[PDB]
Each structure stands twice: as C-alpha cells, then as structure tokens.
Design a protein around this ligand. Structure first.
Ligand SMILES: Nc1nc2c(ncn2[C@@H]2O[C@H](COP(=O)(O)OP(=O)(O)O)[C@@H](O)[C@H]2O)c(=O)[nH]1
Ligand SMILES: [Mg+2]
Length: 169
C-alpha cells in the first residue's frame, strides 16, 4: 500500500541542490559535499496518511549549454527546479532549464516545483519573492522559497512536489 515516486532536482551550480536534498533526506545541513557527482538518495515519508518511497535524483546541475542526459527524463514523476535568491544568474538559468526540460519531455504537462533557495542570506538577496512567484505563475508551477539550513523549509519543498505530482495525476 506504499507509493514510489522519483523526483529529479535541477538547477544552476551552487544554488543548493545537494544541501536542500540532504537536509530533507538526513535532516542535517552538511558543510562540505562533492561539487559534481550526481547521486540518487532514497527517502521514506508519510504524507496525508499515505506512505511514499522516494528516489531523489540530485543532478550535477546544468546551464544554458547543458545537454540533458536521458536520466533527466526517464521515469521521473516530478521535478524541483531550484535557483538561489542571491544569484540573478541562477535565476536566468533556471528559466532556460525549464524551457529545455519542456523540450525534452514534450507536452507531458510534467509536475514542476520552482524553489528559491538560500532565503537566510538576507544581505545577499537579489531576487525578490515576487519575481520568483511571478515565474512560477508563468509556468503554472508550485513555488516556495527555502533554506538548506532550515529543515522545515526543505521538508515543505519535497512534500509540495509530491502534492503537485498527485494533482497533475
Ligand atoms: N547560507 C546558505 N548556504 C547554502 C544554502 N544551500 C546551499 N548553501 C551553500 O552553497 C554552497 C553550494 O551548495 P550545494 O548544495 O553544493 O549546491 P549544488 O551544486 O546546487 O548542489 C555550499 O557552500 C552550501 O553550504 C542555503 O540555503 N543557505
Ligand atoms: Mg551538488
């Protein structure tokens, strides 16, 4: 009576893909972590009384020139696209990543969740909550800001993509 889902985490380098995922999976804010390796974490979570077996694909990250690997579109039930609120570059790149993703999958009307990470770095913020929300609305995607240092924000992100998936289902 369990349900397995595979979620791919995408985004520009250093926006916090690994840190967010690991904060969710192990409940800890890791300080150091290999900058390039693509790894698939496993996580068990019960949402709405429903148990889920999650496979979280923490990708190596991509940019305007990346050529999406097949592993980005096979058996993926949902995608989390993250950018850093401290980087306009990561924000402009997440738009390109979204476009490439739609090109690679087609019109599958895939479940997508946009995430503006690093919200704790108040001083270095350059992307507003409104800009992030406007983008998500442009895509009709879920939206949330987060901080790999605040476990509850990381949990909300993953719970949210699960609901988006169920909704599009
Ligand atoms: N302050 C702060 N630093 C973060 C956050 N998320 C990631 N980082 C830091 O940003 C750097 C890159 O994070 P990492 O997860 O490796 O990025 P990735 O390449 O997107 O997976 C590391 O030095 C992290 O400690 C966050 O929410 N807040
Ligand atoms: Mg990483």
């Amino acid at each position: 009576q369990s349900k397995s889902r595979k979620i791919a985490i995408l985004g520009y380098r250093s926006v916090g893909k690994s840190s967010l995922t690991i904060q969710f999976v192990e409940g800890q804010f890791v300080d150091s972590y290999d900058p390039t390796i693509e790894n698939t974490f496993t996580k068990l979570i019960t949402v709405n009384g429903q148990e889920y077996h999650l496979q979280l694909v923490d990708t190596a990250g991509q940019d305007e020139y990346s050529i999406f690997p097949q592993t980005y579109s096979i058996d993926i039930n949902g995608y989390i696209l993250v950018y850093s609120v401290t980087s306009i570059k990561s924000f402009e790149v997440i738009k390109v990543i979204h476009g490439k993703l739609l090109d690679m999958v087609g019109k599958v009307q895939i479940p997508i969740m946009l995430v503006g990470n690093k919200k704790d770095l108040h001083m270095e913020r350059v992307i507003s909550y409104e800009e992030g929300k406007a983008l998500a609305e442009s895509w009709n995607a879920a939206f949330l800001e987060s901080s790999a240092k605040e476990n509850q924000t990381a949990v909300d992100v993953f719970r949210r993509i699960i609901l988006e998936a169920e909704k599009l289902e």
